Design a protein around this nucleic acid. Structure first.
Length: 491
DNA sequence: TGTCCCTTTATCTCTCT
DNA sequence: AGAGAGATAAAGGGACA
């Protein structure tokens, strides 16, 4: 037969019951768990399906999938049941944080290491818990914690890094590697290459920081003399998540892209200054003549689509979907370029293709309103959320559809919508704010934390905001959001 | 294979003026 | 509101017991 059938039979033999309460896992969730956690994760979920659902831990089903769908997810599950009370009580963390720590490869290690090392990190080095958690909240968190413990002193003192900087570095997959490599290369890159520490920190503060830093060290000279790049541009390529891959590729392709296709070096850096920038540069080299021919896309537009995270996915998706979107859905290509010119262009485009008729027919929106919603990072997330929430928002609350679209039409519009639904009653009913004001606060990027900040203050007043009326607090919220709301807490 | 660590990519949310 | 930055997810490899 096949070495895996006995395993898969066990997968489904259990899977059937997970569709029952308390979890009611759907095909999707179950796939996710089977795929990433393995057979032992799926059995673990089932075995402990009650223990971690209500009394005492009270996890949502989404939270249980979150923890179980990683390598060793079973171990993370047995560890969460053990340490979550301890961490929540003996260290003052919340449920959210613990789960966030648990939801990664080697989640048990990370949890156990937070338990063993949070006190010493928070005192002897004065890190805040929030910082101890951020460092923990990545694959291999255990290592980054131990490596932050070991190297925080030498990195602040012998190298001049602030604790904020040390944390930014560690709070990425392969965090230990990033730290150890900063130890070694930081003088070299500052003295030998004239980099400022803020830049070295910037490069190291992504996954594959180790590879990025090393590769900057190796190719910064080449790129600067022999290619006409400034150090500014080079750090940008390195610090943006494309890293090693993006740097190696730019060296390869910058000449070609400038020569054959008439791109400025500047246009080329913008394509690489994003996670997977290499995928983005190559795809451009393949598809720039294609999309500019049978379409009428200008290179500016093509560069624009390419100049975001997952530009390749964006460009490839534009190629497939442009006709059908223009022809069947009556979109101009300019609208099509607009939807694709953000991170996750692919998703926004696929989601518009699917949801544009339902948003218009069922909910009485204009295509313009659908493009506008879609023309932002996580547009897919905003579109699906408008669909779900636009009736309940403009039906009980009393919001206009124009208003809802204003909230949805910014990065994190899903967050801002879900948040407006939660907090509009209390803000209006309990603290006297008008709906138009709530919309105004949520009709900006960072809508969600803005709202939470202005509910924090009103509900549990800091006297340090005393001399400000509601309207004043609101004016701050619409201009600066959470940041402007707090800073004022420090005045 | 089970678990842990790491790198790359893609996506999503928030900040900063 | 556009550039920059941070957080979260997804996929897959090395490594080891």
């Amino acid at each position: 037969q096949w070495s895996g059938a006995r395993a898969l039979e066990a997968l489904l033999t259990v899977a059937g019951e997970l569709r029952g309460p308390p979890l009611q896992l759907d095909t999707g969730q179950l796939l996710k768990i089977a795929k990433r956690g393995g057979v032992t994760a799926v059995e673990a979920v089932h075995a402990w399906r009650n223990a971690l659902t209500g009394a005492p831990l009270n996890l949502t089903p989404e939270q249980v999938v979150a923890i179980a769908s990683h390598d060793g997810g079973k171990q993370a599950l047995e560890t969460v049941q053990r340490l979550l009370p301890v961490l929540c009580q003996a260290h003052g963390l919340t449920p959210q944080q613990v789960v966030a720590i648990a939801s990664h490869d080697g989640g048990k290690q990370a949890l156990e290491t937070v338990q063993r090392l949070l006190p010493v990190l928070c005192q002897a080095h004065g890190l805040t818990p929030e910082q101890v958690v951020a460092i923990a909240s990545h694959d291999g968190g255990k290592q980054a914690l131990e490596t932050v413990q070991a190297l925080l002193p030498v990195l602040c003192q012998a190298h001049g890094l602030t604790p904020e900087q040390v944390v930014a570095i560690a709070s990425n997959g392969g965090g230990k590697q990033a730290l150890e490599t900063v130890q070694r290369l930081l003088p070299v890159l500052c003295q030998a290459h004239g980099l400022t520490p803020q830049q070295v920190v910037a490069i190291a503060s992504n996954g594959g920081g180790k590879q990025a830093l090393e590769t900057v060290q190796r190719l910064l000279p080449v790129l600067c003399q022999a290619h006409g790049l400034t150090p500014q541009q080079v750090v940008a390529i390195a610090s943006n998540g494309g890293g090693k891959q993006a740097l190696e590729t730019v060296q390869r392709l910058l000449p070609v892209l400038c020569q054959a296709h008439g791109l400025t070096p500047q246009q080329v850096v913008a394509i690489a200054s994003n996670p997977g920038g290499k995928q983005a540069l190559e795809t451009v080299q393949r598809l720039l003549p294609v999309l500019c021919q049978a379409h009428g896309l200008t290179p500016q537009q093509v560069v624009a689509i390419a100049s975001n995270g997952g530009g390749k996915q964006a460009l490839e998706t534009v190629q497939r979907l442009l006709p059908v979107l223009c022809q069947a859905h009556g979109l101009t290509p300019q609208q099509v370029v607009a939807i694709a010119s953000h991170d996750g262009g692919k998703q926004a485009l696929e989601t518009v293709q699917r949801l544009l008729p339902v948003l218009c027919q069922a909910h009485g929106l204009t295509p313009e309103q659908v493009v506008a919603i879609a023309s932002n990072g996580g547009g897919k997330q905003a579109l699906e959320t408008v669909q779900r929430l636009l009736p309940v928002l403009c039906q009980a609350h009393g919001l206009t559809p124009e208003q809802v679209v204003a909230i949805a039409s910014h990065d994190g519009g899903k967050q801002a919508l879900e948040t407006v639904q939660r907090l509009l009653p209390v803000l209006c009913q309990a603290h006297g704010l008008t709906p138009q004001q709530v919309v105004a606060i949520a009709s900006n990027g960072g809508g969600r934390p803005a709202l939470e900040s202005i509910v924090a203050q009103l509900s549990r007043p800091d006297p340090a905001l005393a001399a400000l009326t509601n309207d004043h607090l609101v004016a701050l919220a619409c201009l600066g959001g959470r940041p402007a709301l707090d800073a004022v807490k420090k005045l």
